[PDB]
Structure formats: C-alpha cells, structure tokens
C-alpha cells in the first residue's frame, strides 16, 4: 500500500461527519486533537465535525487545522483496520500527515 | 492518645515482591477471593481500551504473568497502575483480615496516599470492614486502569516511542536535588523562553518533594535535553514513571470525568467515614463526600494537581493536633521512604513517641481440624509405593539395580515373541522390526488367583497388567497400613483409583487366539482400575488415562485434581506397561523411535533413540492433613503439577522446548520455589540428541540461570539423571518409575551414578560446569539439610506433544510421642488365605525378626500395633505372645516347625466363637 | 507407628497364554 | 461456536484443552497392522486423537484420552469440567468416538 | 421458635414502643464488570 | 434510640432447610470457608 | 451470611445486645467475643 | 450475533485400508 494525502483543495462542508458519529475511535482522536489545539491557544476544531453550519465562515487557519486533524484521524482509523503502509506521499498539506 | 495513619505510595515503590507475597497467601479466604476477582475486573477493563493500546498489552491467565514484565520494565502505564493498586489493596486486606487488625476508625486513624494511593485512600475510608471493602476495591482497580490508560494516551499523543526502546517504557520524570522548587521553576522558565518550545511539550514541575528536592516531568527526549543543562552541585535521579501526570496544561475536567465513568450512578454509594488527609489540595481534611465524588477528586489530584509532598507531614501532625492526640504510629503500605515518615510527623508534635507491643503469640490456637489450609492447593502426601521392575520384584531390588549402575537391557525372551523371525538388521519382510532388545519382566505371568477370588481359567485370560496392578495395589495398601472403613479418610466410598495405560497387547495377540467369556473383561483397560475398585470394595471413581508416554503422570495429575476438589479422600494412582505385541515394537522402529544398538544412552553423543522397558507401579496418595491425622507413613509430598502441549513443534512427534520451559516456570511460580530450592531433576531423558539437548537447555535455563557476567546464580550444585538408562522406557509407567526412583533416593540419601553416557558427552548441551550442574558418574551423597527439605523436579513427555511435570518435597519431620508403652506382654498376629501363604508369612516374619532383633524397646509394641490394628485378618490365622522379641521369635519358630512337619492349617469356622 | 513389615507371601502360579506360529507376521495373507 | 484462536482472552492458544473419550483402537489391530509403516504409531495410538486437534489448531493446553469402557465420554466431560472449575483452561473441546 | 411474638412482648414493657417499621433496602451497590460472576469454583459450564 | 437483639434458638427449631440454604450459598467466600471448615472440626471432635 | 453477604453492620456494645436459649448461649458467647466476621470464624469453630 | 451458517464444504476423498483374507479367524494357526 502507498498512502496518498490530499491538500486543501476539496475540503467541503460536513466532511467526515459519518465517521465522527459511527466510530468511537475517530471521535476520541478528534476530541484529543481539539483539546491539544486549545492548549496551544489555537481555535477549537470540534464544531467542524458536529455543527456543519460553521464551515461557511471558517477562517483559513481553522480550515487547515480541520484538514490536518481529519487526515491524521482517518489514517489512524484505516491503520486500525490492518493497513500496512509501504511508503507515504503528500501535497501542499498532505506532506505533514 | 496515639493516632495511626494508613499511608499508601505511588508507582515509585517496587511492588513486585508484595504481589508475589499476596499470590502466595493460602490461609485467608478473603484475600484469595480478592486476588481471584481482581484479575477478571482488570481484564474486563482492559478489553475496553483503544486499538493502539490493546496491542501493547500482554495476555495473562493470572497475575503471576505481570510480575516478570513489571520487573523487566515492559509494562504499559495502565497495567502498572492497576497492579500497584492491587498490591496496595491486597496488602491492606491481608493485614486487616489474616493479621487480626482492628479496622481503622474515624476517632483513632487517618488515611493518606500519593498519586496512586489517593484512590485506595477513598476506597478504604468509605468501607468499615474487609467484606465491605472488597467491592469498592474492585471499583478502584477499574478506576486505576482507566486513569493509567488516559495518561498513557495523552503521553503517546505528545511523543513517540524512540527507536532505541525495544520493549522498555522510557521514564517521563526525574528527581532533582540541590535547588529549591522556586528556583528550579525559574530554570524551567528560562529554558522554555530560550528553546522556544510548544506550551504542551514544555517541561514542568511535577512534584515538590522537599526544601531542596523536587521532581520534574517531561517527555524522554525533552527531559534528557533539559537535564543535560543542570550542573553540579545539583543531583539528578531517574524515576520509573512512564506517563505524564500532574499536568494542568495537559488534562482538563473532561479527562477526570471520563476516568470515573466506569462507576454506575446510584444513591446507595457509601460516603467516606475515616478522614482522608489531602495535603496537595487546598483543604487537608476530606470527610463526608460520596464514593464517586471523592474518587473523581482523587483522579483530578493525580492528573491535574502537583504533589505537595513537602507538606504531608505538617498536614498529618496538624490533624493529630486537632483531636488532642500527641503521637502518630505510621502504618505505610508500599510506600517509599516510609522509615522517615514517623519521625517527620512527630517532629511537629510535643512528643511522647513510644514503642509498640508484641504480636501476642499466634493469638489463640486453631481448633483441631481448623489449623489446616483449605483443600484447594494443599500438599499431596505419598504414603506408599510398590512396583515390579526389570530384574526386580520390589523397590529394594530396584534400588539395588540403580545404585550399582546396571544395564538391564537384553534381547526379547522367547516368552513374548521369537527373535530369529521377528527381527532383522535389514528388515525386508512386512511387520519385521530392526531392533529386538528391551527390558522385560520375566515374572509378569505370576499371580495368586485364589487370593483375589479368581478361577483357574479366568486368570490366564486377564491381561498381566491387571494382575500386576492388583498385586502392587494390595502391597501398597498393606505398606500404607490402610484398611477399608478403618477411619474417615479410608471409607470405601472416598477412594478413587486412577491409572495410566497405553496398550492392550494381551487382547490383540495373546487372548485373541481363542476368544472366550473373559475376553472383554480380561483385556479391556477400564478393568485395570475396575478390578482394584471391585476386590477392595472401593465405590469411588475409576479411570484409565492414555497420554502415550506420560499417562502415569497425566493420570497422577487427575488424581491430584480430585484430591484438590474433594471428590475423594484417598487415591490409588498406578501405571503399567507390559509388552507382548510384536507389531507395536515393529511400528515404533519403523517410525525411528527405538535404538538399534542397546539401552537409552541419555546425554551421550551417540544417542539414537530409546529402549522399551516393562514396569508396573502403584502409589497411595492423600492430602497431607489426612495422612497426619491417620498416622500414616509419609514418604514424600507433591507441591504442584501442570500440563500443556507442544503445539508449536515442527512436526507431530518431535518436541518443542519453549513450551517445556513455560511449563517449568509455571510450576515453579505456582509452588513459590526459586531455582536454588530444587536440588535434583529427574529428566525425561529418552536418549535422543535433539530431545536431550532441548530438554537440558530448558531445564538449565529454568533452574540454572546464567548471570549477565557469564557466571552462575546457583550457590549449590544441581544434578540431573535419567532412569531410562538403567531400566529403559516404559511409555506408560515412566513417570511412576521416576517417582519411585526419587522416593528411593530420598529414603537412602544418595544420588545414583549415571550409566547412559558410554563414550563422550553430547556437544550440543550447554556448559554444565559453568552453570554449576553435574551428571554424577559415580554415586554421590544426598544428605537431607538440617532444619530443611530436599526438593525435586520431575518431567514426563509424550510423542503426541504432551508435557507433564511436578515438584516433590521431603516429608515433614516425624515427631513420635517417644512414650514408653507401660504394658508388659504383647501379641503378634499373622494371617493368610492359604496354608502355604501362612508358612511364607511365618518364615518372612522370623527373618524380619532376625534382622530387627536389637533395634530398641518400642519395636515390639509397634510391631504388635502394625500386625493387629493395621492389617486385614484372613481365614488362616496364627498368633504369638511375649514380653520381648526373642520370645515372639521362638514361639513363631515352633509354630512354623509344626506347620512344616505336616500340621496342615484349617480355616477358622465362618461364624466364629460364641 | 506402621513398620515396613515383609510383603504378603503370594502363592504365585504361572498363568500365561503363548503367542504361537508367528501369525502376527502374516496379517493379511491367505493360507498359502 | 464462532471461536477463532487468539480472538479473545478466553480463546488464547494456551487456554484450550482437549479431552476425548475412547475405548478401542481397531485400526492398528486389524487395518493398518497388515503393513506396518512410518505412521503406524502416530495414527493408531489413541493419545494422538486429541493431540492432533491440539496440533492443528495450535492449542497449547492439556490433551487427554480417557478409557472407561462405556462411560468414557461422560468421564472425559467430568475431567474437562474439573479443569474448567479449577482454572487450568478457559475452553474445552470434549469429544467421544 | 415463636420469634414473631418476641418484639411485641419486649416492647410491651417500654413506653410508646415506636412499633418497628424498618425497610432500608435499596443498598445494592453495582458490581464492577467481571465482579458479578460467582467464583469459578462451582460455576455453570455452558455448552457452545 | 432503637436497640436490636440477636436472639438464637435451641434444638426445638427445625434447621434442616437453613442448613440446605447455607450449603447452596456461593456468592460469599467467608461463608464457604466457614462451611468447609466446620465439618472438619465436627469430625475431629 | 447475614453480616457478610448481607452487608449488615456488626453488632456493637451501644446499639445491640445478644441473647440465647439452651443451645443458643454458646453462639451468643461466640458472637459477643468478636468485632467482625473474620474475628468470629475461629471462635465459631471453637464453639462448634 | 453468530448465525448457524452451513458447514465447510469438505473436499472429501476415501482413504481406507481393507481387512482381507479372514486372518482374524486364524489367530494362532500355522500356514499348513
């Protein structure tokens, strides 16, 4: 497997809300990331997976934080299912995760 | 006017020894129940962990598996916190239940803890008795597991396991001494402002341990980087804390509430009655809060508050000063630097510190019958053992063949099957064998039929295994001096009969040449123990066990389980192997199991299989208190036994050493014996190079560990031997034969020589000399240590992959009353079911008298007791009376002269006298 | 106290059935 | 039963014993005894009845064969239940042939 | 034996007697998961 | 202000059913230990 | 069983008294010489 | 929830050794 990561091109409203509701590990990871971010004085990123009505007025920093948190949580969720990455490639923001 | 404090400690204290001590407790029902229920709750709470954390948790059947990992440092924070909590709670419960300690009360006691003992503090301040404490203790165990898991999750999110970990979990904190906390805080602030670290990865002051010492926590890499900045005369020490705690910048109330969400809500929760000292919090005294509320407070202190460990003493003293008391009697459990607690607390009080009284002896004796330990996991005493071995007819001849180092192997006698037609060096015909050697019993077909109510035509059709089992069982019962219905433990319905057999050659080749009425009952294997149950009128279980070359030991295990469960009070455990079917030998040879040259050359560099050896053995077993109350002759004790399978082998037949080492470690751990306690090891030793080398490696690794410096840990020598070089391989009685050798060795205090090594040692074995283990080539003294015991380890393996092993201990020190029988005249009685047997009994009795003429005065009273109160009196009878032993000899000699002259014996009339 | 007195004097006799004619080496052949 | 080795704590490969109840071995007396070969003893002997099971499923727990004439299966069940009650195993495969 | 008469007889010698009507109950704390099952000694053996 | 009395009876009160109840108890370790140790003391006496 | 599995507070010298009849006086003595079930079991065996 | 699904479709084959020549009725006789 090669895990390709995507930049900030296609971040739409209410993305990854199905996973945030039907998976407890995903929700725990998102809550952990939100607590850490609020520790770093960054804005909270919790509503981006609950409300879906704040995506319209999301600041660029909030959007990038949401993108990276989503990428990390999604990768961890897929790894827990038995995905053995052989190499990782990225993009503008896909390199970090 | 002397307060007491129950102070619990954090993860700094090493609690592995306490865990082992609690696991070894036997004489406390409440402690055993708590130690049995804690692991189940712990496993249930572990199953509720995240995906990442469940791959870093080991599988354990019992808490005996977390001790080696706790010592090795390869235990994740959740399990370590739970084990610390379990150890503290178990120590408190054992102290206050078996130790007969008055439970703490809100007028003379207080509780205290640090970062893991604050949980047990509330758990103990909520209850009022041990029974009222166990469920709260289990709740606290679950809460501790959750707390550890949460801290571990945050830590693992904050940093990654460095590439140079390899199992161990790096420390997240270190003690720094030589600088006040208010200045180490400034050092941390300056280092943060300079290095420009993230607010979450910054080092923090996790504890204020004193006026010139503290504890600073951070991730391994950052912690090392910051510690490298600290210079003399400041001292740094590395604590074994594997996760971040006491971090207000890493935890919030959400984590605290998540931790305590395993406690269901209710209005029945107890409050806290014994005041708890909370020195870290703003208020020191905590009383009145419910159980879950105070539990959440404790979790909050352990996750969000810094340890104010420099104010504990001043707090405790203050509490004592509020009630008017004048002294403190510390009662720490698993606390570090506890020795200073008392002086530190009393330093602030006006004084009056005084010593403490004694334990008051055993504090009342136990009622007779209540002094024992429960039937569950009690020593299994051995009372007597009889057997027929090659070139032998007793255990004494067995010792004669052993101590003289004889090789009993020989070609197949013509009674079993021919050799000029059944054997060839290059087998070209069908069913022909490449080998023909074996260690046989030449008197297998020798039975006393009339004694056992058997017809002359019923006897030839009974498998010699059944006949020899009857003979040996009767002999062993006589030696043990047990009569049916004589006492509570020998009631006919409390006696089971387990056995081990693996063949029915008599049915297949001998009695199948003409099938008759006794074919099935004569040949079937269940009748082996069936006859023993029937003739002696024993109405208990009757089993036959077939685990190939471990049956006798496997069967033994079964019996012990019964003894441990209470199904029977006495067991008759046997093992038989009589070879009469040539095809069995031919198939063992075609499968490349039999040595084509001779006997079993155990440990020899030219070991090429084994040799088949016939043997029958029977042993009498009881629980130790049962044999002590009945005043029975105790030879040895069994402390433990276990079994598993060599499933990971590379084939069905060949063995596997990892499972064997696991089995040995399991039995050693359950018995509570270190490697030094064992002195001998009767190895399976079948005489195979691969098998011998693997078994030797496993045994030496278990019992002769090698130090990291390459030296030996054993302070005393260790010896290893194999019976199969002398008498051969039994394949169903090998375990009982080995046990018989061990019993004889314990009797004679000798280690026989080894005869398997013919040419040169095997080059595959470890360096035994470096490990302080020897293979005695000449007989060696094996004295019993004074005020001590000799302990042995016995193994038995099967070609089907089954491994059994047990631990043997010396019988207790016999303490006879040593009182003088005031009587003057004594009687000696002899009996038999035949006149010839009467003559034989008289002759053997006069011979025994000649051997024992000049022993002591108690010999005659004890002989009278043994002959009268510990025997079954048949029809034909004889008696003698005397004031000394010589009169008995003369009387019996005259009776024998009369019998031999022609005075035939007549059975006494069935009804008896009026 | 139980002493290790001699064993019972069994009036042993020989009851034995003898494998004869080497039939176990012909498990499957006819009467040839 | 839907049990897979190592799936849960109760199905670990080392917590599974195999008790079987047998009273005869006719194959090695009349069928495979007409030509003894390398597999004569592994096949005929009763100790391999449970053992083979233990080997195939890689169960590293006890493995017993019982012989009580016509109560073999219930005797083996009694032994397996004793093992379960005591705690030697967490799962038992009790058979009779 | 004849216990049911003990209370009325004893209280007959005391003023008021405050006829005992105690219920209490509601004192069943929930058990930790894995702590409700009875000890594995003498436990049912389920067939799967 | 309400004392309690622990009153025990004599051989008149049939106690076979109470004995059976105590024998079937399994959720109390102390009771099980007591009922396993009492028969041994009885037998010894 | 009442005072261990039933989670009943053990009798004390301020809120409880013991009484018995012919065979019950032995049990009364045993129960009045203990402060907990663990402290009671050995006295109970002595009384048996 | 575990359902009672069908059993594995074993690819069964016949492995059998046949008792021949009625040799079990002559356990002890010579060839003659």
From Swiss-Prot, chains C, H:
Known function: Polyketide synthase; part of the gene cluster that mediates the biosynthesis of cercosporin, a light-activated, non-host-selective toxin. The perylenequinone chromophore of cercosporin absorbs light energy to attain an electronically-activated triplet state and produces active oxygen species such as the hydroxyl radical, superoxide, hydrogen peroxide or singlet oxygen upon reaction with oxygen molecules. These reactive oxygen species cause damage to various cellular components including lipids, proteins and nucleic acids.
Effect of disrupting the coding gene: Abolishes the production of cercosporin. Does not display any pigmentation. Leads to fewer necrotic lesions on inoculated tobacco leaves compared with the wild type.
Stated name of the protein: Non-reducing polyketide synthase CTB1
Residue numbers of the full-length protein present here: 1257 to 1288 of 2196
Description of what induces expression: Expression is positively regulated by the cercosporin cluster-specific transcription factor CTB8. Expression is also affected by nitrogen and carbon sources and pH, and is also controlled by another transcription activator, CRG1, previously shown to regulate cercosporin production and resistance.
Domain description: Multidomain protein; including a starter unit:ACP transacylase (SAT) that selects the starter unit; a ketosynthase (KS) that catalyzes repeated decarboxylative condensation to elongate the polyketide backbone; a malonyl-CoA:ACP transacylase (MAT) that selects and transfers the extender unit malonyl-CoA; a product template (PT) domain that controls the immediate cyclization regioselectivity of the reactive polyketide backbone; 2 acyl-carrier protein (ACP) domains that serve as the tether of the growing and completed polyketide via its phosphopantetheinyl arm; and a C-terminal thioesterase (TE) domain that facilitates the release of the final product from the enzyme.
């Amino acid at each position: 497997f090669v895990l390709a990561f995507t930049g900030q091109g296609s971040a739409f409203a209410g993305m990854g809300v199905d996973l945030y509701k039907r998976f407890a590990s995903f929700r725990s990871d998102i809550a952990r990331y939100d607590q850490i971010c609020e520790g770093m004085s960054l804005p909270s990123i919790k509503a981006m997976f609950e409300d879906e009505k704040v995506f319209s007025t999301a600041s660029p920093t909030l959007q990038q934080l949401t993108h990276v948190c989503f990428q990390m949580a999604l990768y961890r969720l897929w790894k827990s299912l038995g995905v053995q990455a052989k190499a990782v490639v990225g993009h503008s923001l896909g390199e970090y995760a | 006017a002397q307060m007491r404090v129950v102070a619990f400690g954090d993860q700094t204290y090493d609690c592995s020894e306490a865990v082992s001590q609690l696991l070894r407790v036997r004489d406390d029902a409440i402690v055993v129940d708590f130690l049995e229920r804690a692991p189940a709750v712990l496993k249930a709470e572990l199953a509720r962990l995240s995906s990442e954390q469940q791959e870093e948790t080991p599988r354990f059947a019992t808490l005996a598996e977390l001790v080696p990992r706790y010592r090795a440092g390869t235990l994740n924070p959740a399990v370590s916190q739970a084990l610390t909590c379990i150890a503290q709670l178990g120590l408190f419960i054992r102290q206050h239940s078996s130790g007969q300690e008055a439970y703490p009360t809100a007028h003379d006691s207080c509780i205290t803890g640090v970062c893991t003992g604050a949980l047990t503090a509330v758990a103990v301040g909520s209850a009022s008795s041990v029974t009222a404490l166990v469920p709260l203790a289990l709740h606290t165990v679950a809460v501790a597991v959750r707390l550890g898991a949460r801290a571990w999750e945050i830590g693992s999110c904050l940093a990654d396991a460095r590439r140079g970990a390899n199992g161990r979990y790096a420390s997240w904190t270190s003690a720094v001494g030589g600088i006040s906390p208010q200045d180490l805080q400034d050092r941390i602030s300056a280092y943060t402002a300079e290095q420009a670290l993230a607010s979450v990865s910054v080092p923090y002051l996790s504890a204020a341990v004193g006026p010139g010492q503290s504890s600073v926590s951070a991730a391994p890499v950052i912690l090392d980087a910051f510690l490298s900045t600290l210079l003399r005369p400041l001292t740094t020490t590395r604590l074994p804390i594997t996760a971040p705690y006491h971090a207000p910048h890493l935890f919030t109330a959400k984590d605290v509430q998540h931790v305590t969400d395993c406690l269901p809500p209710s209005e029945a929760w107890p409050t806290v009655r014994i005041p708890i000292i909370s020195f870290s919090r703003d208020e020191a005294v905590s009383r009145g809060a419910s159980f879950p509320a105070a539990m959440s407070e404790a979790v909050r202190d352990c996750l969000i508050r810094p340890i104010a460990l420099d104010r504990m003493a001043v707090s405790i003293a203050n509490h004592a000063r509020d009630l008017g008391k004048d002294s403190v009697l510390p009662s720490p459990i698993a606390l570090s630097f506890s020795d200073k607690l008392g002086p530190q607390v009393n330093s602030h009080l006006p004084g009056a510190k005084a010593p403490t009284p004694e334990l008051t002896s055993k504090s009342i004796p136990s009622a007779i019958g209540a002094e024992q330990q429960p039937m569950a996991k009690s020593p299994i005493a051995i009372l007597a053992a009889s057997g027929r071995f090659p070139q032998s007819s007793s255990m004494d001849q067995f010792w004669d063949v052993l101590i003289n180092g004889v090789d009993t192997h020989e070609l197949v006698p013509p009674t079993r099957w021919n050799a000029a037609t059944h054997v060839s060096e290059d087998p070209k015909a069908k069913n022909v064998s490449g080998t023909g050697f074996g260690c046989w019993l030449h008197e297998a077909g020798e039975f006393d039929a009339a004694y056992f109510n058997m017809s002359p035509r019923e006897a030839p059709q009974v498998d010699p295994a059944q006949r020899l089992a009857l003979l040996t069982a009767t002999e062993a019962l006589e030696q043990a001096g047990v009569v049916p219905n004589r006492t509570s433990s020998t009631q006919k319905n409390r006696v089971g009969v387990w056995y081990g057999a693996t063949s029915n050659d008599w049915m297949e080749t001998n009695s199948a040449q003409n099938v008759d009425t006794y074919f099935i009952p004569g040949g079937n294997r269940a009748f082996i123990p069936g006859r023993v149950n029937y003739f002696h009128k024993f109405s208990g279980p009757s089993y036959t066990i077939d685990t190939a070359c471990s049956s006798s030991l496997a069967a033994l295990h079964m019996a012990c389980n019964a003894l441990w469960r209470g199904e029977v009070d006495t067991a008759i455990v046997g093992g038989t192997n009589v070879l009469t079917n040539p095809d069995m030998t031919a198939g063992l040879d075609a499968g490349h199991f039999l040595s084509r040259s001779g006997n079993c050359k155990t440990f020899d560099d030219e070991a090429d299989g084994y040799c088949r050896g016939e043997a029958v053995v029977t042993l009498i077993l009881k629980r130790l208190p049962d044999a002590q109350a009945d005043k029975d002759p105790i030879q040895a004790s069994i402390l433990g036994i276990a079994t598993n399978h060599s499933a990971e082998a590379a084939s069905i037949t060949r063995p596997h050493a990892g499972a064997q080492q696991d089995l040995f470690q399991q039995v050693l751990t359950e018995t509570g014996l270190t490697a030094n306690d064992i002195s001998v090891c009767e190895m399976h030793g079948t005489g195979t190079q691969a098998g011998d080398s693997g078994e030797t490696t496993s045994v030496v690794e278990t019992l002769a560990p090698l130090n990291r410096s390459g030296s030996a840990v054993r302070t005393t020598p260790l010896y290893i031997g194999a019976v199969k070089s002398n008498v051969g391989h039994a394949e169903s009685a090998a375990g009982v034969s080995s046990l018989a050798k061990i019993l004889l060795m314990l009797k004679h205090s000798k280690i026989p020589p080894h005869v398997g090594i013919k040419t040169k040692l095997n080059h595959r074995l470890p360096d035994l000399a470096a490990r302080n283990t020897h293979i005695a080539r000449s007989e060696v003294p094996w004295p019993r240590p004074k005020n001590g015991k000799r302990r042995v380890l016995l193994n038995n393996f099967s070609a089907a992959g089954g491994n059994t092993c047990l631990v043997l201990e010396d019988a207790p020190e016999p303490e006879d009353s040593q009182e003088v029988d005031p009587r003057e005249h004594h009687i000696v009685a002899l009996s038999a079911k035949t006149p010839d047997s009467m003559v034989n009994n008289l002759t053997n009795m006069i011979t025994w008298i000649d051997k024992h003429s000049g022993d002591s005065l108690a010999t005659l009273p004890q002989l009278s007791y043994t002959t009268t109160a510990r025997r079954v009196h048949h029809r034909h009878r004889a008696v003698a009376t005397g004031t000394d032993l010589l009169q008995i000899r003369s009387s019996l000699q005259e009776q024998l002269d009369r019998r031999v002259s022609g005075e035939r014996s007549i059975p006494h009339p069935p009804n008896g006298p009026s | 106290k139980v002493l290790e007195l001699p064993a019972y004097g069994w009036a042993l006799k020989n009851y034995w059935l003898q494998y004869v004619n080497d039939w176990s080496l012909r498990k499957g052949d006819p009467a040839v």
